[PDB]
RNA sequence: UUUUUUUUUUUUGACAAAUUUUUUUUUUAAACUGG
RNA sequence: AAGGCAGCAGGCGCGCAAAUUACCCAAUCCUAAUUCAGGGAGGUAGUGACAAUAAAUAACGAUACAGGGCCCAUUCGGGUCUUGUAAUUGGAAUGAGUACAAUGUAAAUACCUUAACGAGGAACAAUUGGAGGGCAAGUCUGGUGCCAGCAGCCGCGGUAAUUCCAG
RNA sequence: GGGGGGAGUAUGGUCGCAAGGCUGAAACUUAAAGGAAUUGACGGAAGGGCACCACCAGGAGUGGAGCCUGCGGCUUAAUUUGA
């Protein structure tokens, strides 16, 4: 061929993904309180 | 041809410290080489040196005592203001607390330390450590 | 030694020799020839608006075997025709002919990127909104 | 452990137990990391938490016969559909993280 | 008496594309009275 | 017959690319015959994620399971040492905002004060990019099957994708 | 001299009834091109050995005929299939 490209199947995978909704979860703390969660969760060894 | 006799003399000394010799013979000799060796002598970097009197220019034999790492020349003889000396001592001296940069002021050939307490400056000749 | 002059009265030679050898530098030449103004498709600009002429499919070079889904665009301020890659999937559906897209550089400062041969540009905005918004269904393309 | 004393014991001292954890941050927990040494140094065969006698039989029906399939059930707990298959009747070594997600996704309180 | 001493060559073109990848684990042998 | 916004505000055009046809001489100063008049100089406000500074999005508590190592052990137990999962509850504090007032100001707006309201997961709910290496963070699951696409670079994808599209 | 190409090409000048020298770009394209050495593999390279799954000297043949036995092909409802 070496003349054209088949533009037919653009988006063929994002169209056929079996979409699923983001499950609702409790929110996470923000700001200084998130560094609390982070930098204890990386250091829980009592 | 020979462009500077100070560079030849300091090359000769530096080559014989490396090989292990205890003496050199340099040729020719000038007042600048005599004064540069006198500054090296008073800081203990070389031993005794003797000047052989030709009728031409003279030769010098210099006794070496180890303890010399490099003597070098700076060519061209850059003009050095009195605030630029610590830009040279930082560049080509191994530490801030030994080693000398020899200058040529109108007060004479001298190392950088007592050019400072004389508060003079001028052109640069070289360095010893 | 060392092949360059060293004498104290020789600053002219060193300065003119540095000048002549600066021309071997890639970006010094383009700064002093104005190659961005005259030769580059964008007029030395980060972005340029265009007009879509056709949808293109370009074969990816080895060792990749995909079809890259780009478009051919004619710029307003210059009239030059460039090929621009249309990013992640479904965006070629969001672009059509005569949508007045906005273009940017493709990352490599005037060079092709990845397995796409001969494309130096990408579309950012189509119909004046975004491609991120249209891809993520955050905004809607105007009816045109 | 969890905020019981780790703030109460920090009264103007600020350093007791401030050392770093093992350090994966996405690989799963170390609930058997103690048992991994014991099976390494003991030079015989040991039985690995043999079976699932009634937590298999009774909880497969309460979970899956209600509405769901294992292909669905393994998708919401994020494991391969043969993992739930060997949690059905028998033939598994039960680890804590998989059995915990099995419990909290379908409610039946048998551990 | 340095003394020893195998002489050789007709013809043989070609073999599509992509690929094969290795990390250093023990934080675990830590438990004792003061009468 | 009349004209010259590279003054202020605004419009068209051009473009990747840039604000209100607002208020006032009260400050800074200027001019005049001059203390008084005039000043789109200048100042005030509107638009303004150009840059820059400071720093909300929570704080104290109470309450529990499930293991694993070792020790002693009857085997039913503790008695430490650690691993994860939350999940139900309580009184306290506050400003983001809505605003009497006063202050601010040429007059206002806003700030700084301050009566009265103003927190329990449904909100008063933080995003932007990433998770093979460079380069910090999954060899978890579903889809696709050198297609779609990713990928600054090396590379990924041809039916068990740590790299695409998703949770 | 300043990554590999484009290219010692284009243009202008110059040396000119010649070939052609000298001077000498850019657009565009590209993730390596390259240097030295290492271990294998290969050589219509060399040297030293070795083998009737190599030859030499020979024997018995097979290939030719009929059959029966596997394979391919064709046929078939199927002529199950691997190599």
Swiss-Prot record, chain A:
Cell compartments where the protein resides: Cytoplasm
Modified residues (Phosphoserine): 15
Region of interest: Disordered: 1-34
GO biological process: cytoplasmic translation
UniProt keyword annotation of Phosphoprotein present: yes
Subunit structure: Component of the small ribosomal subunit (SSU). Mature yeast ribosomes consist of a small (40S) and a large (60S) subunit. The 40S small subunit contains 1 molecule of ribosomal RNA (18S rRNA) and 33 different proteins (encoded by 57 genes). The large 60S subunit contains 3 rRNA molecules (25S, 5.8S and 5S rRNA) and 46 different proteins (encoded by 81 genes).
The protein, known as: Small ribosomal subunit protein eS30A
Organism: Saccharomyces cerevisiae (strain ATCC 204508 / S288c)
Lineage, uppermost ranks: Eukaryota, Fungi, Dikarya, Ascomycota, Saccharomycotina
UniProtKB/Swiss-Prot annotation, chain C:
Cross-link (Glycyl lysine isopeptide (Lys-Gly) (interchain with G-Cter in ubiquitin)): 55
Keyword rRNA-binding attributed: no
One of the protein's GO biological processes: maintenance of translational fidelity
Record's GO cellular component terms: cytosol; cytosolic small ribosomal subunit; ribosome
GO MF: structural constituent of ribosome
A Pfam entry, by short name: Ribosom_S12_S23
Coiled coil spans: none
Family: Belongs to the universal ribosomal protein uS12 family.
Note in the entry: Present with 10600 molecules/cell in log phase SD medium. There are 2 genes for uS12 in yeast.
SUBUNIT field: Component of the small ribosomal subunit (SSU). Mature yeast ribosomes consist of a small (40S) and a large (60S) subunit. The 40S small subunit contains 1 molecule of ribosomal RNA (18S rRNA) and 33 different proteins (encoded by 57 genes). The large 60S subunit contains 3 rRNA molecules (25S, 5.8S and 5S rRNA) and 46 different proteins (encoded by 81 genes).
Name this protein carries in UniProt: Small ribosomal subunit protein uS12A
The organism of origin for this protein: Saccharomyces cerevisiae (strain ATCC 204508 / S288c) (Baker's yeast)
């Amino acid at each position: 061929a070496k003349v054209h490209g088949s533009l037919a199947r653009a988006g063929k995978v994002k169209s056929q993904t079996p979409k699923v909704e983001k499950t609702e979860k409790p929110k996470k703390p923000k700001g200084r309180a998130y560094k609390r969660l982070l930098y204890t969760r990386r250091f829980v060894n009592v | 041809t020979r462009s500077s006799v100070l560079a030849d003399a300091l090359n000769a000394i530096n080559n014989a410290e490396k090989t292990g010799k205890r003496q050199v013979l340099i040729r020719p000799s000038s007042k600048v080489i005599i004064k540069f060796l006198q500054v090296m002598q008073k800081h203990g970097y070389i031993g005794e040196f003797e000047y052989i009197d030709d009728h031409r220019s003279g030769k010098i034999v210099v006794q070496l005592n180890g303890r010399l790492n490099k003597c070098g020349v700076i060519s061209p003889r850059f003009n050095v203001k009195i605030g630029d000396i610590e830009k040279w001592t930082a560049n080509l001296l191994p530490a801030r607390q030994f080693g000398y940069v020899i200058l040529t002021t109108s007060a004479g050939i001298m190392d950088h330390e007592e050019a400072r307490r004389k508060h003079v400056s001028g052109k640069i000749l070289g360095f010893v450590y | 030694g060392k092949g360059k002059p060293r004498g104290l009265n020789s600053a002219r030679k060193l300065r003119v020799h540095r000048r002549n050898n600066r021309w071997a530098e890639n970006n010094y030449k383009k700064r002093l020839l104005g190659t961005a103004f005259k030769s580059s498709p964008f007029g030395g600009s980060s972005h340029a608006k265009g007009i879509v002429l056709e949808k293109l499919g370009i074969e990816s070079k080895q060792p990749n075997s995909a079809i890259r889904k780009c478009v051919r665009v004619q710029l307003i301020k210059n009239g030059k025709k460039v090929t621009a890659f249309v990013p992640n999937d479904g965006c070629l559906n969001f672009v059509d002919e005569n949508d007045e897209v906005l273009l940017a550089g493709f990352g490599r400062k005037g060079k092709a990127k990845g397995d796409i041969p001969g494309v130096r540009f990408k579309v950012v905005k189509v119909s004046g909104v975004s491609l991120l918004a249209l891809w993520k269904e955050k905004k809607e393309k105007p009816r045109s | 452990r969890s905020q019981g004393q780790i703030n109460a014991a920090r009264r103007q001292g600020l350093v007791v137990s401030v050392d770093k954890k093992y350090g994966s941050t996405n690989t799963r927990g170390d609930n058997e990391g103690q048992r991994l040494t014991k099976v390494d140094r003991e030079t015989d065969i040991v039985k690995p938490k043999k079976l699932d006698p009634n937590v298999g039989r009774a909880i497969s029906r309460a979970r899956t016969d209600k509405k769901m399939s294992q292909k669905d059930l393994a998708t919401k707990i994020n494991e391969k559909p043969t993992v739930v298959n060997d949690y059905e009747a028998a033939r598994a070594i039960p680890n804590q993280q998989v059995l915990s997600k099995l419990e909290r996704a379908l409610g039946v309180k048998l551990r």
